[PDB]
Amino acid sequence: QKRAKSYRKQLLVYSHTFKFREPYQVLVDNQLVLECNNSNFNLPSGLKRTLQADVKVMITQCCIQALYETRNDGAINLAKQFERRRCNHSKSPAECIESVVNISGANKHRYVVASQDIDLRRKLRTVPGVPLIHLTRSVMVMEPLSTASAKAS
Amino acid sequence: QKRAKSYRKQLLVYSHTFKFREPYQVLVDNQLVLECNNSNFNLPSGLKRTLQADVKVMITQCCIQALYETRNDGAINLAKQFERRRCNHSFKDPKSPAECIESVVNISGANKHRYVVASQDIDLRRKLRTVPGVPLIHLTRSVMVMEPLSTASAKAS
Ligand SMILES: [Zn+2]
Ligand SMILES: [Zn+2]
Numbered sequence: 001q002k003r004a005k006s007y008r009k010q011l012l013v014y015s016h017t018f019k020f021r022e023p024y025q026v027l028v029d030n031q032l033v034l035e036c037n038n039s040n041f042n043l044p045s046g047l048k049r050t051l052q053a054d055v056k057v058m059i060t061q062c063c064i065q066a067l068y069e070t071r072n073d074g075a076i077n078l079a080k081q082f083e084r085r086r087c088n089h090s091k092s093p094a095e096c097i098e099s100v101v102n103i104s105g106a107n108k109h110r111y112v113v114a115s116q117d118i119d120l121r122r123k124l125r126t127v128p129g130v131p132l133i134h135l136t137r138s139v140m141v142m143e144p145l146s147t148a149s150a151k152a153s
Numbered sequence: 154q155k156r157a158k159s160y161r162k163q164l165l166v167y168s169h170t171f172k173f174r175e176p177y178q179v180l181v182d183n184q185l186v187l188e189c190n191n192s193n194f195n196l197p198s199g200l201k202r203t204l205q206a207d208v209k210v211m212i213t214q215c216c217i218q219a220l221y222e223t224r225n226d227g228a229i230n231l232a233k234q235f236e237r238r239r240c241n242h243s244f245k246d247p248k249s250p251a252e253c254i255e256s257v258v259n260i261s262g263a264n265k266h267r268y269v270v271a272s273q274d275i276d277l278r279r280k281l282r283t284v285p286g287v288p289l290i291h292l293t294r295s296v297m298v299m300e301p302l303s304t305a306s307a308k309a310s
Pocket of ligand 1: 060061062063087088089091096097
């Protein structure tokens with residue numbers, strides 16, 4: 001809800017200064033796919049939620065090939081529901097996405113990229129107008145000390 | 154470690170004033186188990202890490218019976234690997250998981266058995282902070298996020 005607010009403001013600039021229009025085109029990388037699979041995160045609905053608009057969710061042939069090699073039969077089937085972006089390659093998932101998104105330092109095709117590869121994200125921020133999405137992992141927390149615990153000192 | 158550091162200082166009072174000792178006696182409720190199965194989060198490893206010591210992971214019979222009813226075989230089997238905490242709760246004295254844990258942790262106003270409670274039930278958590286000296290643990294939901302606008306984006310505005 002609260003984030004939907006901050007995001008609403010961010011999307012605006014992609015639409016105005018960058019000419020982005022529904023449905024957003026989102027390249028999903030292999031790591032994100034694995035991740036969402038073995039933690040049961042609905043990747044499709046997750047993107048429509050955060051982008052707050054129709055999204056076309058896609059995966060490059062290099063990313064899905066890499067998935068193929070994991071023989072992680074569960075990730076694979078998921079990737080397949082997505083629309084394939086036919087890259088003209090032969091590379092690593094990372095470089096694939098980079099060369100597809102980064103055309104002469106411009107996001108010519110107005111992709112958004114959802115990746116768990118913080119290395120790929122860093123080098124995409126360089127390119128102006130590239131929305132970046134990722135999944136924050138689950139963590140185990142201990143509540144701060146209660147006041148009743150406090151008063152026993 | 155930002156946490157490991159913080160948690161270290163918190164455990165100090167539980168051991169100092171409340172006499173908590175490795176291995177920690179942790180009650181794990183049915184919601185937490187369920188969500189750790191669906192997230193593939195290693196519950197026993199998580200607890201061992203956050204408490205910074207070996208732990209005996211237990212679940213009351215009331216909590217596991219609730220799991221049985223969900224007919225979620227993965228969570229059920231996860232629970233089955235835990236030490237069972239026998240309560241004397243029945244068709245005679247029936248209790249929900251929350252009421253079960255509370256009756257077993259809150260003894261005349263004191264955590265007599267020095268349980269730590271790991272639970273996704275905020276209401277149970279709130280009722281337990283009442284009792285002095287009960288460590289509380291829970292899982293955050295993994296969330297999808299969009300990075301904040303990049304400088305390269307802002308500059309071109
Ligand atoms: Zn490619
Ligand atoms: Zn019980």
